[PDB]
Amino acid sequence: MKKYMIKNKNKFREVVVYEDDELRLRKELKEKLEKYFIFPPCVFSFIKGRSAKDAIILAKEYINQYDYFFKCDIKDFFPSINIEKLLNLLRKRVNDVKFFKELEKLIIEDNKIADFKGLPLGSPLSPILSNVYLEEFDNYFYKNKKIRYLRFCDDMIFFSNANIYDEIINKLKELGLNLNETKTILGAKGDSVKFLGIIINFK
Ligand SMILES: [Mg+2]
Ligand code: NA
């Protein structure tokens, strides 16, 4: 028994497949896995102590400080996650072999439920694993002193004095990821932008 239930938006895999118990083991592993990662502070989704509201406050500050901004969003993010790349990223930090083994088994089970298309939206593990997946991407743009960068799930905005969207698109391609070309916004200083549903104005 499992049709569908719109959750945040749509999807076309996972459903009342996930209903409890298996949720507990996934929720327990998620809490265990949070102790292995400190994601860069420019990432605001699925992390205790952070929220979309924080990203909006930072965006409203950063927009006054750069000549350009680029707002974009990853297309079909969770279905697009490469499992082999995700498991290589996990093993670099989860050096507890028993915990890594349990995580790997569940990820492979979740991927099968997703019909081998990335991670299912109904698994409690998928959100934190999406942050693992983009951690090196996030740090690459975070640690650049000449730009600012904010991400909430698949939604990103970059503030810079030189346009970098070609580099963004390429770094995403290294992860198997693409932008939703329809929702991409470039702006010059003085322009407003919609980010996470909020209009952010210069000054
Ligand atoms: Mg998207
Ligand atoms: Na930066």
Residue numbers in the entry: 1 to 203
Which sentences from the paper describe this structure?
A highly divergent group of RTs, predominantly related to group II intron RTs (GIIiRT), are genetically associated with a subset of Type III CRISPR-Cas operons and reportedly play roles in spacer acquisition from RNA. Here we identify that CRISPR associated RTs (CARTs) directly prime DNA synthesis on both RNA and DNA. We demonstrate that RT-dependent priming is utilized by some CRISPR-Cas complexes to synthesise new spacers and integrate these into CRISPR arrays.
To elucidate the role(s) of CARTs in CRISPR-Cas spacer acquisition, we first characterised the synthesis activities associated with the RT domain of Caloramator australicus CaCART-CAPP (CCJ33120). To better understand the architecture of CARTs, we elucidated the crystal structure of RT domain of CaCART-CAPP at 1.63 Å, crystallised in space group P32 with 3 monomers in the asymmetric unit. The architecture of the RT catalytic core is composed of a ‘palm’ subdomain with an RNA Recognition Motif like (RRM-like) fold, which contains catalytic acidic residues bound to a single metal ion (manganese coordinated by D73, I74 and D154) and ‘fingers’ subdomain, adhering to the canonical ‘hand’ analogy for replicative polymerases. The N-terminal part of the ‘fingers’ subdomain is highly dynamic, reflected by the high B-factors in the modelled residues (average of 122.0 Å2 for atoms in the first 20 residues, compared to 40.4 Å2 for the rest of the monomer). The structure of CaCART-CAPP RT domain was elucidated by molecular replacement using a bacterial Geobacillus stearothermophilus GsI-IIC intron RT (GsRT) from the GIIiRT protein family. Both structures are remarkably similar, with a root-mean-square deviation (RMSD) of 2.1 Å across 190 aligned residues. The catalytic core of GIIiRTs contains three major extensions, which differentiates them from retroviral RTs, including an N-terminal extension (NTE), Motif 2 extension (RT2e) and Motif 3 extension (RT3a). CaCART-CAPP RT domain lacks an NTE, which is likely contributing to the higher flexibility of the N-terminus. Deletion of the β-hairpin from CaCART-CAPP ablates its polymerase and primase activities, similar to replacing residues in the equivalent region of Marinitoga piezophila CAPP (MpCAPP) or HsPrimPol implicated in nucleotide binding. In conclusion, RT domain of CaCART-CAPP is a bona fide DNA primase and polymerase, that is active on both DNA and RNA templates, initiates de novo synthesis with NTPs or dNTPs, and has a strong preference for priming on templates containing a CC sequence.
